[PDB]
Amino acid sequence: RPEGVNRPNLLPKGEVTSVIDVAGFLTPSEEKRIITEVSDLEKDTGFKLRVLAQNYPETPGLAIREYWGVDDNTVVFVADPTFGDILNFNVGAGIDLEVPRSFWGRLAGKYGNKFYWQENGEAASILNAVSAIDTCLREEPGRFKCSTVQGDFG
């Protein structure tokens, strides 16, 4: 409970990037793979997935608002083992309209439970969750949209 953490100092230095890995969970090559996926998704759908890997309270926190221009089309994925579900999804109102709410909890259960996180490591959890979000958001509308999660079969 620190007034809401707001640390511009923990933002990356140069040009905006859609991955802030404060915690050191991802290699540069893993970061690059997420950046590619996230760019493509945004190009194809207009949805903005942004990834913040952190250990609270070492977070840019409220600083990410201006940084990423957080809006109705933004899902902020916080991966942080200090808080609750480890995999935390902050879902813009525009995404919320297209995705069943149960999806985020199912995604968190699958790739975010503490056994999966410890066994497979932080990178694998994050990468697998990014891909499942990408897949979900790209689905055509329908009564069974995102009722299953990527990897369920494949």
The binding site for Ca ion (CB under 5 A) comprises 21, 26
Shortest Cβ 68–Ca ion spacing (Å)? 18
Q: How far is the CB of 36 from Ca ion (least distance, A)?
A: 15
Considering beta carbons, is residue 49 or 51 the nearer one to Ca ion?
Answer: 51
Strand, coil or helix: what is 6?
strand
**Rounded to the nearest whole angstrom, what is the least distance from the CB of residue 128 to Ca ion in the complex?**
17
| Closest CB to Ca ion among residues 36, 102 | 36
Task: Select the residue whose beta carbon is closest to Ca ion and give its number.
Answer: 21
Q: Give the C-alpha separation, 78 to 87, whole Å.
A: 6
Contact 15, 70 (CB under 8 A): no
> Nearer Cβ to Ca ion, position 26 or 129?
26
Q: From its phi and psi, is residue 138 left (phi > 0), alpha (psi between -120 and 50) or beta?
A: alpha
Please, are residues 149 and 143 in contact by the beta-carbon 8 Å criterion?
no
Closest distance between Ca ion and the C-beta of residue 53, in Å?
8
Q: Closer CB to Ca ion, residue 26 or residue 79? A: 26
Which uninterrupted H or E stretch holds 91? Answer: strand 87-91
